[PDB]
Amino acid sequence: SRRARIERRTRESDIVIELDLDGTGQVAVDTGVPFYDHMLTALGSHASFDLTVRATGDVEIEAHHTIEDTAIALGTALGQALGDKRGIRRFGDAFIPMDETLAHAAVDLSGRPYAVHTGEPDHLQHTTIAGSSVPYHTVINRHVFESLAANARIALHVRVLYGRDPHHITEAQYKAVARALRQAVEPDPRV
């Protein structure tokens, strides 16, 4: 059994995560930031986790604090569910083509906490993905992966090999992280 429930209440947000590493993609995410909900739903589903995320935070300021607190709590849940990490593949990686975009992620689940994020085009430092509700500033992508790696205590390297559309670029990264995690957490039949 590799499950964790994390509650994290701060001045800026209130978060509950329930995570099962050995799931079937049963995912429900509600943070008040719908593009982030979409990204974390893709992450949970493509990692074949079961994942529920309920977050409320100070989105009148912007999504940053809610996005960051959620990623901290999620990284904490991941590290706690991994337990002693015995018998697992440990290393995982995944390429994700998404139309014109190609992204990649590589992880070491027993590596020191460390995140490296490279290749994302410069326009994503000031791009906004905006709909009818709270918008998502793609400059936060790097922050999400850093917070996940720092709190799960894993090495996480995310690369954009190339791409143009900011939604493709972002979604392909979250999916690459997802499928790298999926490979790395699997039981290793020879360890």
> Binding residues for a copy of itself, per CB under 8 A?
24-25, 34-35, 37-38, 48, 58-64, 91, 93-100, 102, 106-108, 111-114, 116, 118, 123, 125-135, 137, 139-140, 142-143, 146-147, 150, 155-157, 159, 161-162, 164-167, 179, 182, 190-191
Q: What secondary structure letter does DSSP report for 61?
A: T
Residue 76's SS3 state is helix
- Return the beta strands (E) in 75-181 as ranges: 91-98, 101-108, 114-118, 128-129, 136-137, 155-162
Q: Candidates 43-51, 128-136, 155-163, 165-173: pick the segment binding Mn ion (CB under 5 A).
A: 165-173
Neighbouring C-beta atoms of residue 8, cutoff 10 Å? 18
Q: Distance (Å, rounded) from C-alpha 24 to C-alpha 161?
A: 29
Residue 61: CB minimum distance to a copy of itself, A: 5
Residue 29: CB minimum distance to a copy of itself, A: 12
Question: Could you say whether residue 68 binds Mn ion (CB under 5 A)?
Answer: yes
Which residues sit opposite 8 in a β-bridge? 15
Is 58 or 186 the residue whose CB approaches Mn ion more closely? 58
